[PDB]
Amino acid sequence: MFRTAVMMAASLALTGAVVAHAYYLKHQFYPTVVYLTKSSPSMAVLYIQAFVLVFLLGKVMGKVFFGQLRAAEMEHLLERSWYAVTETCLAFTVFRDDFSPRFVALFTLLLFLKCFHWLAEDRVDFMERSPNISWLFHCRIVSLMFLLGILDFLFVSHAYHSILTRGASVQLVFGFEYAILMTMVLTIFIKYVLHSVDLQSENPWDNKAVYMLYTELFTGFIKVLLYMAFMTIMIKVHTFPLFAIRPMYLAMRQFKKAVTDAIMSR
Amino acid sequence: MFRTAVMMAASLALTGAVVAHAYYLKHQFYPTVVYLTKSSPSMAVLYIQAFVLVFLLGKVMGKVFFGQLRAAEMEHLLERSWYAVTETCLAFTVFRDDFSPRFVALFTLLLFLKCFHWLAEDRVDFMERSPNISWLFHCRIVSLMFLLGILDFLFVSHAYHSILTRGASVQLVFGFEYAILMTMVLTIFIKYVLHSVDLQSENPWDNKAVYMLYTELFTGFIKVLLYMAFMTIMIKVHTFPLFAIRPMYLAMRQFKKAVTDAIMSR
Amino acid sequence: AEMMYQTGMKILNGSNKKSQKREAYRYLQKAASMNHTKALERVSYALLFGDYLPQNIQAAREMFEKLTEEGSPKGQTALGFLYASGLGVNSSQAKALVYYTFGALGGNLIAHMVLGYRYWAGIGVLQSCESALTHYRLVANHVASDISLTGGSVVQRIRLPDEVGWVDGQLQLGSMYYNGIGVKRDYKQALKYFNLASQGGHILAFYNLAQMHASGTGVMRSCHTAVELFKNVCERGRWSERLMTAYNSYKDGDYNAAVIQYLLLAEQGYEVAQSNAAFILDQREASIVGENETYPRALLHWNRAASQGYTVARIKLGDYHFYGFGTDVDYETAFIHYRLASEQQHSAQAMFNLGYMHEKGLGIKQDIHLAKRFYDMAAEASPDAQVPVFLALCKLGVVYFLQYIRE
Amino acid sequence: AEMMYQTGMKILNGSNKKSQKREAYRYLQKAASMNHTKALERVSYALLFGDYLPQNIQAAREMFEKLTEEGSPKGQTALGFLYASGLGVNSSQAKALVYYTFGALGGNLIAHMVLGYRYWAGIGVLQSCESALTHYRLVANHVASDISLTGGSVVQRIRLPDEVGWVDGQLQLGSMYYNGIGVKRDYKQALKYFNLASQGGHILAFYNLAQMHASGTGVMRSCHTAVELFKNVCERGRWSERLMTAYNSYKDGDYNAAVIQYLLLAEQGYEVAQSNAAFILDQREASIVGENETYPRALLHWNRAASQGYTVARIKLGDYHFYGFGTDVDYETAFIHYRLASEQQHSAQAMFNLGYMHEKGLGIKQDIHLAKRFYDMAAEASPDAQVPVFLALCKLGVVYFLQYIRE
Amino acid sequence: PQLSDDIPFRVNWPGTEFSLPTTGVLYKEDNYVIMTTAHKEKYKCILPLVTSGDEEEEKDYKGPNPRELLEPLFKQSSCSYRIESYWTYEVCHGKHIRQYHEEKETGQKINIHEYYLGNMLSNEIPTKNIEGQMTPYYPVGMGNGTPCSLKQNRPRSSTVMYICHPESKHEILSVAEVTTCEYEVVILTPLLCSHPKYRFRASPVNDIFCQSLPGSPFKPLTLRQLEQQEEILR
Amino acid sequence: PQLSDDIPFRVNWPGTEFSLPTTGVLYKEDNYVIMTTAHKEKYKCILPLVTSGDEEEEKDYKGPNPRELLEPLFKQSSCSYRIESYWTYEVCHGKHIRQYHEEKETGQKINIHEYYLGNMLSNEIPTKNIEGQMTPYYPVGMGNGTPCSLKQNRPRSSTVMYICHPESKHEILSVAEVTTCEYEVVILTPLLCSHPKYRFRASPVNDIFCQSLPGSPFKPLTLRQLEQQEEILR
Ligand SMILES: *[C@@H]1O[C@H](CO)[C@@H](O[C@@H]2O[C@H](CO)[C@@H](O[C@H]3O[C@H](CO[C@H]4O[C@H](CO[C@H]5O[C@H](CO)[C@@H](O)[C@H](O)[C@@H]5O)[C@@H](O)[C@H](O[C@H]5O[C@H](CO)[C@@H](O)[C@H](O)[C@@H]5O)[C@@H]4O)[C@@H](O[C@H]4O[C@H](CO)[C@@H](O)[C@H](O)[C@@H]4O)[C@H](O)[C@@H]3O)[C@H](O)[C@H]2NC(C)=O)[C@H](O)[C@H]1NC(C)=O
Ligand SMILES: *[C@@H]1O[C@H](CO)[C@@H](O[C@@H]2O[C@H](CO)[C@@H](O[C@H]3O[C@H](CO[C@H]4O[C@H](CO[C@H]5O[C@H](CO)[C@@H](O)[C@H](O)[C@@H]5O)[C@@H](O)[C@H](O[C@H]5O[C@H](CO)[C@@H](O)[C@H](O)[C@@H]5O)[C@@H]4O)[C@@H](O[C@H]4O[C@H](CO)[C@@H](O)[C@H](O)[C@@H]4O)[C@H](O)[C@@H]3O)[C@H](O)[C@H]2NC(C)=O)[C@H](O)[C@H]1NC(C)=O
Ligand SMILES: *[C@@H]1O[C@H](CO)[C@@H](O)[C@H](O)[C@H]1NC(C)=O
Ligand SMILES: *[C@@H]1O[C@H](CO)[C@@H](O)[C@H](O)[C@H]1NC(C)=O
Ligand SMILES: *[C@@H]1O[C@H](CO)[C@@H](O)[C@H](O)[C@H]1NC(C)=O
Ligand SMILES: *[C@@H]1O[C@H](CO)[C@@H](O)[C@H](O)[C@H]1NC(C)=O
């Protein structure tokens, strides 16, 4: 906790030194904020204070939604997150959208929501093998089920009206990625539905595994269809992705590990 | 082996179809080749054929330089290569160097050499704990050592004379990455020197571990120095990298795992 | 009869619709049956031209004859075009000129441009700039007059072998400098002020320097600049719109009306309309001409398009002598047309195929190290020759290495 | 004496080196001791001006007096500048005009531009366009003669508060249209052809329309266009190079010679040299002027720079009445100069500070929903107002929400 | 230096035998300058004390009250309007203020968004800062316009501002609001410029007389050739 | 149609009583056309058979051998040179061919890269080509130039190509090489155009004769005139 407060104070000391540098140069309100916007190091430190602010909001959101990290998903976020930091960074620069401090702020909103879906997956994965789960865990995770799926429904609705009214822009890849995230909250629901009927009965159910393998087959078919339609569009309009082939190979492998295993079983 | 030949034939069929489509359009040599270079799908299929060719050359080079993959480094190659192709893609696209079919080839040459250094990493890591090793393994791996070190020395020389003569371009980052790969072949030399003086004596040596830790500290210091100079250069010239902060965190962690462990030990 | 022609011109000038234009000509076609000598010349130029009346070449030849026997300038002009192009009728250059002369005599302007162009490029007659001065003038007086009234209707120049205020006042100031408005006339310095007005693109200035180089005022009267300055004025008449009537026929799939509406302007002496009227005959899309008179007629219009300074028409005159298109195969003759597009126009391809005739010993004696120069020269001339020289130079060194092994 | 002045002008016109220019003036400064009446006027304008001789204002005042008693136009002009600017001497506008009139009488051209500018903007005298026509006319004749000889030496216009052929022949054609060269004169249509020549940027055309709007030819003679057309001709004399002598003093760290070499051109009636001569006095870098006469003198040159149409000089006249710079604090007076830069010049900042006086109830009565309009209007006017309105509108709604809770 | 660009000056040449006026601006015998022209001509040009104080202009007015001057403007019903970027203000003097803007539909319809800002069913003249200057005005305040939603359905009010201009043709300098849905209109008219307390205020001119020293005539030898030169040019 | 842009034509007006010539080009009585002008003038224009065959021009030449014409060019020592993009070829007729390029150093030195391509220490005239067409030439072939590294220190050789031009001033059309370090030079001269077998070849002109029908004059009512109209600008 000491190193966390040190990191916050060592970032806020730079922001209070950048702001006090501009206010001495341009002694008013309006030419100061304009000067921060055009200057590169002045907007850089204001970016750093923004990321520390969204870091600490994530840590307090993780603390209220999960009681304690198991230190086995703590690594598992770190590789995925890196995965996610780089491909948003590559999608931001390939599209020639130019560095704007309201679409960078949108991209870390996608990454912040993407990290919370992944944390829900690993928590519901150990909900399979947790024989001692309180009612606080059950309510606090279905709250995470609702709050996410409504949020991606809202941003899909915001994006597919943006792709019609405005035209072809970067708002297409936002709503498509949230549509994949909409399938992602869809996956963890059915997995929570089948594992809630598991705990209420003091006997194993063989059809639960059959429904779980069928459900993973389902959405995996939905996932590759979303990625394949995502391929066919941006070759036609704008330019080659050069990204999003990262989770696609995992999406075919998700389809490979589900369809072929069910074919070998059934 | 059947699927590899199937993939090669299915790529060459598309390449021959594209070449025949161009030759039917522009019935000569020169307008056919110019039409292939200007067309997007034609150059795309030629890129696919080139990638399949370099894949098969990499497979035969791995077959001739390593007897058999342990099937535990094949994964390590798969994640680290994804990392790497995405870092090279993002570095290629941020720099606004434009899509040229003689710098993409250089980038895949860099990625190919990086993959071979990682394979040398894991092979000498098992050579640390291999009690039955023939002289063929020793000779082939020291041939790999030389060839790699001479190649990065040559490319570092080429890139520093380029950065002196021409001016600030992507050859600077090419030379710096090859300098990091030079530090990598340096690490494995010292590690192979110590693990070779280990095997020739039928008794363990306590000073070998101390020398290994000191060498790791050494080269970790060299690596973080190179990454910091790399930073302090490209904030100054051109633009923020937005890449190469990946292996840097692993480079400082390489420094952390060496310096702090030696401080706790000594 | 005469009442029918008024309805057609009213709907033509009043309606730009394609159906209304064809509906207007229905009375005009019916008035042609009444032998109104003004009525046929607007439907004779549709019966054989297309994109108006349906195309029927034989249906226009016999009614052109009565236009000739009447003595119509618009019938004497076009009947010479039939025998010059061999169009529906056996080709004969001998009396092709006879019909064009009487059309030029009759007051037609097309028969003066063609007769002037034939005297200028030396086609069918002796190249005489004096005779090419006389016929090219009469057109320039009759086109600069209307352009001052119509505003100079600009038309785009479309070449199929490639794809498929501030200065207005300077003309009057330069006119006063040569003539003298309140000052003594000075022909030594009024030339530079008048010649700079033509660099802006206006073609009124193109006329005024032609007369300057004609009578010898200011600069000595040279033949080469006398008619070349005249010619670009004549290439922007009300017949300059005829590219769009021909080019729309090419895009509408009527390829046989883009080879007749282009062969007239090829006869009129263009280079946009002499490559394109040969490019269509290059790919055998035309059907009026036979399958055996398709390449020699496309050789004629590739030859005229090259001598007027076109890069592709000099490479593509090398190809027709390289493979044997319309001529017995001549590697020596094809050799020259490839280097004439190399030293003169610096066409990037034209030194690559210079290498092939150097590398493989065609036409001249083989020399391996001479061929290396022109492949290397190709990469310097263009950015697109970097690739197809590199796969040519690698093949070049393989032969040099394999020959050295056998020794 | 006279032999010393020849050596200085030879090295000045022969060597452009800074040391050689100072070495040339060593004989000129020595010749000033011999009271050669041509020698002092080239070192008077260095002793008080700088970037030549070392700057010493008190060393130039007393030897300007003997230039006045001799009756020199170059001494009568500059001694008026001393009392107009209060420079080293107590300020007095009463006889600042008296010295300028005799300099204007004496044949000096600087004393005619300033007297003309004072009659034009109504500074020190009554605004009379008739008197401003007469004095601005004499400068224009004496500068239009030299540009045709010198070729029009263009000088860049640098504002410190922002950082720190084809038409030549149209002038002679438009001159012949009004006068009549072989045609009847028509003043109704020669106006449009002559006025279009000035849009190219050449100032010879700027002269000729000024006389056109003066005598009433073509268009009725209006005062506003009579001298404004005249003024831009006069702002491009051989004194237009004097920004560079002043601007180089600012970049060389000699800030007290960029406030004297700029205050003359501020007196001469510029706007590039009236903001910059006030921006330097804004930040108190000048040292000749006292610390208590630094803001009222910078208020005077911000006031003249605003009435000549500058956006920043109308915002920065709001600031000086907003905080209380050089004036007792007036929120009502500062209010007007902020809106006058909003409706007129559409300055993006000038409606943001309109919101602050609307939101916080300064000057006028407070209204929360009126302030919302101008913050919203700020974001429409510029791309850079998107940020500092958003943090202003969020603060705006916090007060509206917190007040509603207390109710 | 303090607001010094509002003080007028004028040089005169009254000659040798001249007596400075004792009424108007004050004078002193010390603040004289000895002058010299280019052709060696000596002048002694005196200057007044730059005070121009008080308002002792003998302000008398037996004419009508300022109410009576705008009555012929009211009965003639000739009233103007002003354009803006979007809106259009039509003040009608003595009837109403009308603010409206036409919405031109695609081909057939024209829609009007109209509002009503008013309708006609003290020893010191007040002054308002007009571009920072001092102009006394006539206020005509009036209300009962259309209801305003922000003031909870209260009718709008407006004050008519009258300032005089000689070349005016009944136009508007600007329309402005001191508060929400209550607007201020300024009107140019030529009627009030005859009123001494309502006319455009001009500062008194301080006169620079200057006396001709012996050896120099009544006017300088480099002066009279110039005012005749512009007289020819006119 | 086959190479038809090389056959010259000429229309003549010999009139009513004219007999077609039996020497030159062949004629027929069937290939006549009946003509009509704009003002109704009738003409009968006969045309010849387009053969222009053989070379029966009675080729006789008792003059000097082609060797003797270039001797005055050799002794006068007036010889030219040609520029290119990089190189500069200086053929000297009767001495040498010299190829060189100056390297201008930065201020003081000029470096010369020079080479030597030669030095002066049959019933059918051969024909090369020249821009596609045809021209018989005089070849003058030499060797003993500077050694060539590609041919293992063999001296270069060069042939001098002579073709005639009336307005020539001893310039070069182009310099070309048939093989490495052996070069070909073409030279324009006016001397060989007097030689019947070496002159510039022009095809014989086929004459088109127009017989005037009765009711129409010797030349059309628009001919003569219009011709002389420009005769103004002659
Ligand atoms: C080039 O020219 C273009 C046009 O000439 C410029 O384009 C802009 O076009 C938009 C159109 O979308 C205009 O926006 C608004 O237009 C109408 C009208 O709304 C205006 O009027 C509102 C009236 O409210 C006040 O009315 C009285 C005024 O006397 C007051 O007494 C009263 O109390 C009340 O306050 C006004 O409110 C509004 O201004 C702002 O209002 C609020 C807060 O006041 C702000 O938050 C807003 O941002 C707004 O800007 C407008 O000035 C409007 O339609 C109205 O009427 C329809 C009727 O059916 C309703 O359905 C609808 O909901 C709305 O109520 C539009 O919806 C839109 O809001 C804009 O004014 C134009 N801009 C300019 C500068 O003219 C373009 O800018 C020009 N290009 C440039 C300058 O570069
Ligand atoms: C704008 O104008 C510019 C100049 O006007 C153009 O710039 C180019 O500039 C470069 C300079 O770097 C020139 O390149 C070469 O220049 C010299 C000279 O080499 C030329 O001559 C060589 C001679 O070899 C032949 O000589 C005889 C000729 O009669 C033959 O008989 C003999 O057998 C032999 O074949 C010639 O070989 C060379 O051509 C090519 O040669 C080989 C194979 O033949 C190719 O692979 C090469 O690619 C080469 O192009 C040249 O034409 C050269 O210096 C030489 O001499 C120094 C002396 O110290 C040596 O040290 C050095 O090693 C070399 O031997 C240069 O090194 C360079 O190679 C080039 O010619 C210019 N280009 C043109 C078109 O003029 C610029 O192109 C213009 N811009 C345009 C057109 O857009
Ligand atoms: C054209 O000439 C050929 C050969 O003389 C002949 O066979 C043919 O019938 C002629 N056609 C016409 C239409 O005259
Ligand atoms: C040429 O014309 C004949 C008609 O006599 C036709 O049959 C033939 O197909 C044409 N083409 C060739 C190549 O002979
Ligand atoms: C300027 O005037 C002030 C006040 O009248 C006086 O104190 C000062 O001495 C004067 N200075 C000069 C140089 O005349
Ligand atoms: C004004 O002038 C006086 C000199 O009398 C000086 O002492 C003072 O510092 C100046 N400034 C102020 C603010 O009084």
Q: Is E71-194 in CATH node 2.70.130.10?
A: yes
Question: CA D208, CA D188: separation in Å to the nearest integer?
Answer: 15
Question: CA D385, CA B230: separation in Å to the nearest integer?
Answer: 37
- Beta strands F9-15 and F206-212 are parallel
User: Domain check: are B142 and B249 in the same one?
Assistant: yes
| Nearest ligand by distance to the CA of C294 | 4
- Angle of helix A30-38 versus helix D348-359 axis, rounded to 10: 140
| Block residue for tokens 């052709």 | E39
* Ligand 6 center to D292 CA (angstroms): 6
The residue whose C-alpha atom lies closest to atom 49 belonging to ligand 2 is C373
Which of D106, D293, D340 has the CB atom closest to E37's CB atom?
A: D106
D377 CA closest ligand 1 atom index = 50
D292 in ligand 6 pocket by Cβ < 6 Å? yes
DSSP state of D200: G
CA neighbor of B155 nearest in space, from B132, B138, B171: B171
Boundary residue ending a domain (A43, A65, A87): A65
CA neighbor of F199 nearest in space, from F92, F69, F94, F93: F69
F99 CA closest ligand 2 atom index = 29
Chain B hits for A89, Cβ within 8 Å: 90, 242-243
Residue pair C233/C143 in contact by the 8 Å Cβ criterion: yes
C376 in ligand 2 pocket by Cβ < 6 Å? yes
- Cβ neighbours of residue B128 closer than 8 Å, sequence gap 6 or more: B191, B195
Q: Report DSSP letters for B48-65, one per residue.
A: HHHHHHHHHHHHHHHHHH
Question: CA A60, CA C374: separation in Å to the nearest integer?
Answer: 72
Residue pair C221/C227 in contact by the 8 Å Cβ criterion: no
Residue pair D31/D1 in contact by the 8 Å Cβ criterion: yes
- Beta strands F182-189 and F157-164 are parallel
Chain D hits for C173, Cβ within 8 Å: 169-170, 172-173
Query: What is the experimental resolution, given in Å to one decimal place?
Result: 3.5
Domain tally, chain B:
2
Chain D hits for A28, Cβ within 8 Å: 319
F213 in ligand 2 pocket by Cβ < 6 Å? no
Whether residues C391 and B33 touch (CB distance < 8 A) is answered with: yes
C164 in ligand 3 pocket by Cβ < 6 Å? no
Residue pair A87/B242 in contact by the 8 Å Cβ criterion: no
Question: CA C165, CA F226: separation in Å to the nearest integer?
Answer: 37
Residue type, position A180, single letter: I
Which of F35, F47, F233 has the CB atom closest to C94's CB atom?
A: F47
Using CA atoms, how far residue B33 sits from B24, B27, B99, B103, in Å, is 12, 10, 18, 19
F151 CA closest ligand 2 atom index = 33
Question: CA D109, CA D240: separation in Å to the nearest integer?
Answer: 13
F180 CA closest ligand 2 atom index = 33
Question: CA C316, CA A86: separation in Å to the nearest integer?
Answer: 52
User: Domain check: are B7 and B136 in the same one?
Assistant: no
Question: CA C44, CA F185: separation in Å to the nearest integer?
Answer: 55
Q: How was this structure determined?
A: cryo-EM
Question: CA D28, CA D11: separation in Å to the nearest integer?
Answer: 11
Whether residues A82 and B242 touch (CB distance < 8 A) is answered with: no
User: Domain check: are A103 and A52 in the same one?
Assistant: no
Chains B and F touch (3+ CB pairs under 8 A): no
**What tokens does F71 get?**
């001797």
Q: In what order do the strands lie in the sheet with F138-142?
A: F138-142, F157-164, F182-189, F175-179
Coil, strand or helix at F15: strand
Q: In what order do the strands lie in the sheet with E175-179?
A: E138-142, E157-164, E182-189, E175-179
D89 in ligand 5 pocket by Cβ < 6 Å? yes
Question: CA C388, CA C393: separation in Å to the nearest integer?
Answer: 9
Residues paired with residue F154 on neighbouring β-strands, in sequence order: F148
Question: CA D94, CA A157: separation in Å to the nearest integer?
Answer: 75
Question: CA E159, CA E179: separation in Å to the nearest integer?
Answer: 12
**C269 reaches F (C-beta below 8 A):** no
Question: CA D233, CA D148: separation in Å to the nearest integer?
Answer: 13
**What tokens does B195 get?**
């693990």
* Ligand 3 center to C254 CA (angstroms): 28
* Ligand 2 center to C373 CA (angstroms): 9
Boundary residue ending a domain (A10, A36, A65): A65
Q: Is the C-alpha dihedral spanning A93, A94, A96, A100 positive or negative?
A: negative
**Phi-psi region at C10: left, alpha or beta (left = phi > 0; alpha = psi -120 to 50):** alpha
F180 in ligand 2 pocket by Cβ < 6 Å? yes
Q: Report DSSP letters for A111-137, one per residue.
A: HHHHHHHHHHHHHHHHTSS-S---HHH
Question: CA D372, CA D358: separation in Å to the nearest integer?
Answer: 9
Q: Domains of chain D by range and CATH? A: 2-107 (1.25.40.10), 314-407 (1.25.40.10)
Size of the A and B interface in Cβ pairs below 8 Å: 26
Chains C and B touch (3+ CB pairs under 8 A): yes
What dihedral do alpha carbons B185, B187, B190, B196 form, nearest 10°? -80
Give the DSSP H/E element, type plus range, for residue C301: helix C295-307
**D108 reaches A (C-beta below 8 A):** no
SS3 breakdown of chain D: % helix, strand, coil, rounded to 5?
65, 0, 35
D291 in ligand 6 pocket by Cβ < 6 Å? yes
User: Domain check: are B122 and B149 in the same one?
Assistant: yes
Residue pair E16/E211 in contact by the 8 Å Cβ criterion: yes
D387 in ligand 5 pocket by Cβ < 6 Å? no
SS3 breakdown of chain B: % helix, strand, coil, rounded to 5?
80, 0, 20
Residue ranges of alpha helices (H) inside C107-252 are 110-120, 129-150, 168-179, 190-195, 204-215, 223-234, 242-251
Which of C349, C352, C384 has the CB atom closest to B37's CB atom?
A: C384
Question: CA A263, CA A207: separation in Å to the nearest integer?
Answer: 16
Q: Report DSSP letters for E42-54, one per residue.
A: EEEEEEE-S---S
**What tokens does B92 get?**
């290629």
Longest pairwise C-alpha distance within chain D: 91
**C100 reaches F (C-beta below 8 A):** no
* Ligand 4 center to C282 CA (angstroms): 17
Using CA atoms, how far residue C402 sits from C374, C395, C397, C399, E199, in Å, is 22, 11, 8, 5, 108
- Cβ neighbours of residue B95 closer than 8 Å, sequence gap 6 or more: B170, B238, B239
Whether residues B242 and A89 touch (CB distance < 8 A) is answered with: yes
CA neighbor of E154 nearest in space, from E164, E146, E166: E146
Residue pair E7/D127 in contact by the 8 Å Cβ criterion: no
- Cβ neighbours of residue B136 closer than 8 Å, sequence gap 6 or more: B67
Question: CA B254, CA B215: separation in Å to the nearest integer?
Answer: 12
**What tokens does A113 get?**
């929501």
Chain C hits for F129, Cβ within 8 Å: 332-333, 336
SS3 breakdown of chain C: % helix, strand, coil, rounded to 5?
65, 0, 35
Breaks (C-N over 2.5 A) in chain D follow: 164
Q: What are the residue boundaries of the structural domains of chain E, listed by start?
A: 9-52+203-233, 71-194
Backbone phi, then psi, for C43, in 5-degree steps?
A: -105, -15
What dihedral do alpha carbons A119, A124, A129, A133 form, nearest 10°? 100
Residue pair E15/E212 in contact by the 8 Å Cβ criterion: yes
Backbone phi, then psi, for C183, in 5-degree steps?
A: -140, 160
The residue whose C-alpha atom lies closest to atom 1 belonging to ligand 6 is D292
The residue whose C-alpha atom lies closest to atom 10 belonging to ligand 5 is D90
Boundary residue ending a domain (B28, B62, B96): B62
Whether residues C349 and B33 touch (CB distance < 8 A) is answered with: no
Residue among D66, D68, D87, D95 with most chain E CBs within 10 A, to mutate: D95
Whether residues A34 and D388 touch (CB distance < 8 A) is answered with: yes
- Beta strands E127-130 and E133-136 are antiparallel
The residue whose C-alpha atom lies closest to atom 3 belonging to ligand 4 is C292
Which of A79, A82, A86 has the CB atom closest to B90's CB atom?
A: A86
Q: Report DSSP letters for B82-119, one per residue.
A: HHHHHHHHHHHHHTT----TTTHHHHHHHHHHHHHHHH
| Block residue for tokens 């990493």 | B121
Coil, strand or helix at E147: strand
Domain range for A108 is 66-265
Chain A hits for D352, Cβ within 8 Å: 29-30
**D44 reaches A (C-beta below 8 A):** no
**B93 reaches A (C-beta below 8 A):** yes
Q: Report DSSP letters for C261-273, one per residue.
A: TTHHHHHTT-SHH
User: Domain check: are A129 and A18 in the same one?
Assistant: no
Instruction: Provide the chain C residues 132-171 that lie in CB contact (below 8 A) with chain B.
Output: none
Other Cβ atoms within 10 Å of C141 Cβ, number: 11
**D114 reaches E (C-beta below 8 A):** no
User: Domain check: are A31 and A84 in the same one?
Assistant: no
Residue pair D275/D281 in contact by the 8 Å Cβ criterion: no
D284 in ligand 6 pocket by Cβ < 6 Å? no
